[PDB]
Design a protein around this ligand. Sequence first.
Ligand SMILES: Cc1cc2nc3c(=O)[nH]c(=O)nc-3n(C[C@H](O)[C@H](O)[C@H](O)COP(=O)(O)OP(=O)(O)OC[C@H]3O[C@@H](n4cnc5c(N)ncnc54)[C@H](O)[C@@H]3O)c2cc1C
Ligand SMILES: Cc1cc2nc3c(=O)[nH]c(=O)nc-3n(C[C@H](O)[C@H](O)[C@H](O)COP(=O)(O)OP(=O)(O)OC[C@H]3O[C@@H](n4cnc5c(N)ncnc54)[C@H](O)[C@@H]3O)c2cc1C
Ligand code: SF4
Ligand code: SF4
Ligand code: SF4
Ligand code: SF4
Ligand code: SF4
Ligand code: SF4
Ligand code: SF4
Ligand code: SF4
Ligand code: SF4
Ligand code: SF4
Ligand code: SF4
Ligand code: SF4
Lengths: 643, 643
Amino acid sequence: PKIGVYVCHCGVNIGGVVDVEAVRDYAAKLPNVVIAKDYKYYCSDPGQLEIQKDIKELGINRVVVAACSPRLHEPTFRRCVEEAGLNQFLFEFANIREHDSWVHMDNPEGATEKAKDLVRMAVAKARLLEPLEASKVSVDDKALVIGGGVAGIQAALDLADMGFKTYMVEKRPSISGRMGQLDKTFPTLDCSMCILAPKMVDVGKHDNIELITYAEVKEVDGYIGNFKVKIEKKPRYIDEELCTGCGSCVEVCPIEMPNYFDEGIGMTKAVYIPFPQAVPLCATIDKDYCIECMLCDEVCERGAVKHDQEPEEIEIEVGTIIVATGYDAYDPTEKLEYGYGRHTNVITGLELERMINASGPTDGKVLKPSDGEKPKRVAFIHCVGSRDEQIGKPYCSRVCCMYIMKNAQLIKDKMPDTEVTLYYMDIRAFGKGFEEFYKRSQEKYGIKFIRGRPAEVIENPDLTLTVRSEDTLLGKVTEYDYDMVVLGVGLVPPEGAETLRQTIGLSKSADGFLMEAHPKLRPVDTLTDGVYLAGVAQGPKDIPDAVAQASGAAARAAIPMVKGEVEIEPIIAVTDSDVCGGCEVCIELCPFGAISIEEGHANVNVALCKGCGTCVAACPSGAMDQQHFKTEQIMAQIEAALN
Amino acid sequence: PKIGVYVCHCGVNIGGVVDVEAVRDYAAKLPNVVIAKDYKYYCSDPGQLEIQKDIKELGINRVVVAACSPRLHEPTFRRCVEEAGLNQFLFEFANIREHDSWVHMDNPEGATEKAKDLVRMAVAKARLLEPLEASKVSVDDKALVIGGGVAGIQAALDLADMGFKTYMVEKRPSISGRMGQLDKTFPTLDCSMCILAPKMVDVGKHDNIELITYAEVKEVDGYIGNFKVKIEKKPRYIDEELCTGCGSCVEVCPIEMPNYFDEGIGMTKAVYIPFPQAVPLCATIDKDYCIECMLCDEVCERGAVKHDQEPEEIEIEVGTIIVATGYDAYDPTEKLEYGYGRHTNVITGLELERMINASGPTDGKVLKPSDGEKPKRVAFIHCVGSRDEQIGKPYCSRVCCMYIMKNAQLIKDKMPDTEVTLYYMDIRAFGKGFEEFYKRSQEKYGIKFIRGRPAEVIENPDLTLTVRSEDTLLGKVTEYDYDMVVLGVGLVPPEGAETLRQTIGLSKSADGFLMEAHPKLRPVDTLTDGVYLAGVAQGPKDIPDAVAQASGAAARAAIPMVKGEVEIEPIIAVTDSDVCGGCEVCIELCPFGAISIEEGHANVNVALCKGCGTCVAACPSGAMDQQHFKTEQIMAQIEAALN
Ligand SMILES: Cc1cc2nc3c(=O)[nH]c(=O)nc-3n(C[C@H](O)[C@H](O)[C@H](O)COP(=O)(O)OP(=O)(O)OC[C@H]3O[C@@H](n4cnc5c(N)ncnc54)[C@H](O)[C@@H]3O)c2cc1C
Ligand SMILES: Cc1cc2nc3c(=O)[nH]c(=O)nc-3n(C[C@H](O)[C@H](O)[C@H](O)COP(=O)(O)OP(=O)(O)OC[C@H]3O[C@@H](n4cnc5c(N)ncnc54)[C@H](O)[C@@H]3O)c2cc1C
Ligand code: SF4
Ligand code: SF4
Ligand code: SF4
Ligand code: SF4
Ligand code: SF4
Ligand code: SF4
Ligand code: SF4
Ligand code: SF4
Ligand code: SF4
Ligand code: SF4
Ligand code: SF4
Ligand code: SF4
């Protein structure tokens, strides 16, 4: 063993506290060490060049680096040594920055002694290291996209245009997500369906996209490039291949049920098409409401009605997964002071979006729920379900300000005589053109802004609503009457989010949305390799941000599939057949079942083993041993820590 | 000619105003028309299937669609007819929605008559159409990335990992952009350099990336897949291949000049390295300050100093371009009431970022410019250079709120006894974890928030600063004294932005940043094919949004390069040699020089012609004629409009 030690100054992060001169000499004087050097920034290109030159010249076969935590830069130095010809796993890392220099600033002498001890432990471990060849595994060039909203549609189209065969699983009968439910979009007031429908048709026609709507992902197993996914397609009771979406079955159906697309304010039949631009344009029967009258069977000319349909099980093999499951609107029923669900003329922002839509339940007319007449006075309340510790929702929903202003502008254009007032804490018009939109809400449409979080909404006997709120800029309490009140509800993770998160094995952030690998530089990656996030799945945001995230997720998922191969770490259990007695107290301790028994000896499957070391710690005789974490290595480290 | 006419209801967008029954019968009765049908949504899959079935059955050779504007759905129907075997350009579009139904709502009868006339004109044009084969052109599988900030670095790394050879042009001597200048990042307060430097090294080592720093893009010519780019590499007067970045030349240099990296508050030598983590780690001589003393030549051991270096011209051929040129910080000198550049202890947010940086000019100490001592009282002013019509800056800069709160928190941690007050209009903490960060600024660090836009900053004789501002929530004027005032300057397009925009040929938005193809669904595309935007080039935003945009831009630019081919529209000039007299009054009228003279006859180059039709309109005898816009076709349309 010819150990080369490299102590990093990291500028003054280590050097400021730890004497990189004494440590270097100590390392040079330790047994088996043939060189000790220090450099200002080893992770940089000059430092890696120095390490490679030292390996080439002095013939170092073991490399020890006294630098930051291995979790940051272990792969960097592993590749550095690889490019110089040395084996990947002859390398050792000493943590003297996060564990020594940054936590013992007031004890420089103790810090230097701790650094000496840690480098001694690292060299003790490095003495007994041996080469290990890492196995390559093929990466399937297929992707799964969960969620058929704007983000999911964008991700699927980008992957399919790059040549990868993509599956798109959607739990609703049709794709579109929440963007299909909007009438217009801010800040341009353009029609959302007019621009989304072509993309939906594209997804429906793409040769590289397999669209599975009305389906859920039930099981996910495996790893990057090698995901096995079990999907459950719910029974439509309509044949997708035969149905043309004419709608005669809907015409004849006698039963009426709520339309999920209309968000509780629209009705359809037990057999329904969610909206005219649905993709696939196919009928669906909800058996909770079907009475099995067979009128739809008799009126259908394609023979597409199948009352004996069963749920179908699909198994796919993919290489990457993109979660694009969006969000649900906050339910403000728990805000008792605002009276949602109790007062007749209190509605939410999404319900208003459905109501203002020309294709919505009311044919685009904003009408009071109480009497079906246009309101003359409308109040909007910001931050409902957001920025509120009384309900455990301390985050901003990021879009409610803008869509509140947009819907106020739309109400003004449709009914210019209407009076509109917004109750806000902050106006968060941060995006491109958002501040101009905010100013236009006042200058052009005459919308009134009151800086005050309403205390209460009181329903009067005539069903009008008094908003009781302080005007904080006038510094006085106001009680103003309105014919309609619209709650600016925030965004929450969708129903069934935890089930899918556990199925895939992802973590979630403090707000309840899925967590990205790094907040700053890996916004669309997760810590699970081969799984990516796009859109509001990662947190509330508007359509362009979700689309950018979907494109980025497509690129990130394409990178490994283009590479076609990934490396498996060889830190795995190995059994000594000559020592193993076949006691088998190790097999059950493997959560992945990597250990079996062949010829009376324990045998580990590399594909199943993950390298936890539990079995090795359990083995009394020591027949089992983990590569790179052998018992002798840890024992040497323990001995060096105290001697 | 067997013309099939298809009138779209578009739901009620046309049908509501225009009688799609009378128009269909009129079309059926017109000469050469063999079928007339109407469908609720023709652009949808069922409508395209209907059109294809009609073409296959009745043998239609001309297709006319009375629907929305051609600029929206002409490619859709072109591909629809292609997939049924018909030629792409036998297709005609009548605009009866944007031009008739949506603009004559109060005259339904006049609307229907106008629709009849427009369909008659469309059929008149379609009678004389003929097939045209479109030529394919290869797409170069190479990309250029302009700008070496976080967005540009991300885009280049994503493209290079997908296998494409990428050029990265950077005007500064080193990559990093503005993220390298930050000390920490919000909302996590993690070190920005610690996470950016590995990416910079990766860019510097990638086999698929050619990094050209200290260079500018001078000329761009051509089109998607076929861009010819002329780049000018400025002379460093240091040999990049030889320089190791040791810094001895800096040690010996006698001249002192401002360091651009330190934003006007840091000094370096005439030969300088912008920062220790620079990529490439190379020296640069600024000849505005060099006195040619040759001390650097004598102290350099690599012989890397080249005082006779000249600017170099590089010509590259690429298929896609990604603009990632970032932003500049607003210069608040024009806000005379705040006294920047006049008061000693008034600084900007970016200057404070450099000052709080441990590697900055002051070694991470926040010191007053007047006396070099720590301030005891600090004020932050929000929205400086933003949301202000007095300076023509009506937009939000979107990050100043958060980095103001972050730098206040950093000042508190470094100097807990310091008092910090923020003067704000709205707190825009919209991002993930931003509202929690905002609350933590108060609960944990005790930062004071005053809702008021300061009227004035007055320098007192002792050089302290009185902020005169209304507290609007107390409703009273306040005059508070501070040792330091930090202006929360906004983001503006970088210097030289207009030159590069004109060089490429891009448009800009109202705020001055580059304009995307569609605000909602194409945030990273431009209307110039093959050119994409990433990061703050498209508008102010934070690091994760810029990184998502960079990944999306990489994916979008990869799509056409994976396809490897694009179609050229055949709407081009054609000369009748038997009629052309070689008068040549057409050649100079082509801005692209597509027309030359061979054998005494005008000859058009397809590669140069773009299809404006100017030459055809100029030709008296009619020898020149534009394909798909022939004189006979327009004359027939004129005749049908009036008869
Ligand atoms: C009232 C309102 C108005 C708005 N107005 C605007 C506006 O004007 N402009 C703007 O830019 N933004 C607006 N937004 C925000 C915008 O809707 C979002 O940015 C966008 O919808 C996010 O798209 P997405 O694909 O990430 O999610 P979604 O649109 O929610 O789509 C997610 C999809 O995933 C599906 N799904 C969920 N769970 C599963 C599962 N387990 N398996 C399979 N599929 C699943 C859902 O059914 C859905 O189809 C508005 C939001 C609201 C509430
Ligand atoms: C004081 C301050 C603090 C901030 N703090 C944070 C924070 O804590 N967290 C956060 O997420 N964001 C923060 N931001 C915002 C963040 O800096 C931006 O989101 C990010 O820098 C944008 O990266 P970019 O690559 O788009 O642009 P830039 O970082 O500006 O990089 C653009 C690059 O293009 C180069 N370039 C320009 N013109 C040309 C040309 N013609 N040819 C070639 N190259 C060219 C530039 O030299 C530069 O290297 C802060 C901003 C400021 C001003
Ligand atoms: S190797 Fe680690 S400690 Fe050394 S400079 Fe790099 S990040 Fe800092
Ligand atoms: S089931 Fe039959 S009748 Fe109903 S929409 Fe489908 S094709 Fe039409
Ligand atoms: S069988 Fe069910 S879906 Fe069909 S018409 Fe009767 S109630 Fe409606
Ligand atoms: S975006 Fe506006 S309305 Fe929505 S939570 Fe944030 S501050 Fe409240
Ligand atoms: S515990 Fe040890 S001895 Fe027993 S079967 Fe496992 S490896 Fe063999
Ligand atoms: S190391 Fe862990 S995963 Fe591997 S065989 Fe032993 S118990 Fe199973
Ligand atoms: S073809 Fe045009 S007019 Fe007809 S439905 Fe589609 S978008 Fe509307
Ligand atoms: S020019 Fe020479 S002395 Fe100066 S940094 Fe480069 S190698 Fe070192
Ligand atoms: S020649 Fe110029 S750069 Fe070199 S030491 Fe002299 S002044 Fe400095
Ligand atoms: S982000 Fe905050 S400080 Fe910056 S312009 Fe917008 S409101 Fe003003
Ligand atoms: S203007 Fe007409 S006649 Fe004259 S050279 Fe051109 S094509 Fe020929
Ligand atoms: S149509 Fe326009 S571009 Fe083409 S040759 Fe004539 S003038 Fe030139």
